[PDB]
């Protein structure tokens, strides 16, 4: 389990360039000649080196050479297509501009090797369902005021008191802050039923399905504090 995140070519990539510098920065400051004997005879142990140490194998992957063989490959490529230009190039900077081709040729693969992942929207939890549960101790206690208040209505407006301080109770309290009843999911929809029973029930529990359900259905609910049933 992201056991590691950079490979040896990616971590390689670092190390090489000590290597080339060897042969890069003793190209200059020595006498006239010399200096293209060792550009191209000290490249050849400098990039050995790194292929040397860049020993793997990871036969999880199909691929054995071809991760390795776009590395050596491009490599090789502006190395010998970046010096193939010097024949071809003007005298006026042929070896100037030769030794600055590999450069960016070099610094490229470092930005051709990024894993590149980029993937918008990945599917994050925007917050975590065990909290947001507790909320529900006011939510029991401020229904207390909703069946009391609202028991003292004449038969009438009943509903009303309810749809006043449920609604309103909830958000009044916390205006700020999930204003609307959606903290907890399944109201929306389980509250529904409320106006699809009372309106055809048995005339005897009648508010006593709104008190009983209501209550029940929210004291399931508590249970969920105790565990929320992780996978």
Avoid: C, W
């Amino acid at each position: 389990p992201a056991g590691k995140a950079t490979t040896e070519e990616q971590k390689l990539i670092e190390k090489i360039n000590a290597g080339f510098k060897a042969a890069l920065a003793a190209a200059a400051g020595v006498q006239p000649a010399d200096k293209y004997r060792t550009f191209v005879a000290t490249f050849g142990a400098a990039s050995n080196k790194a292929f040397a140490e860049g020993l793997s194998g990871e036969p999880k992957g199909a691929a054995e050479s071809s991760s390795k063989a776009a590395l050596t490959s491009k490599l090789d490529a502006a190395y010998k297509l970046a010096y193939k230009t010097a024949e071809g190039a003007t005298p006026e900077a042929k070896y100037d501009a030769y030794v600055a081709t590999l450069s960016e040729a070099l610094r490229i693969i470092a930005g051709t090797l990024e894993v590149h992942a980029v993937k918008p929207a990945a599917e994050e939890v925007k917050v975590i369902p065990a909290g947001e549960l507790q909320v529900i101790e006011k939510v029991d206690a401020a229904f207390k005021v909703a069946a009391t208040a609202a028991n003292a209505a004449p038969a009438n407006d009943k509903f009303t008191v309810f749809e006043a301080a449920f609604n309103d109770a909830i958000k009044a309290s916390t205006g700020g802050a999930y204003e609307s009843y959606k903290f907890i999911p399944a109201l929306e929809a389980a509250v529904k039923q409320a106006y699809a029973a009372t309106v055809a029930t048995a005339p005897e529990v009648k508010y006593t399905v709104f008190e009983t359900a209501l209550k029940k259905a929210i004291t399931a609910m508590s249970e969920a504090q105790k565990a929320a049933k992780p996978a």
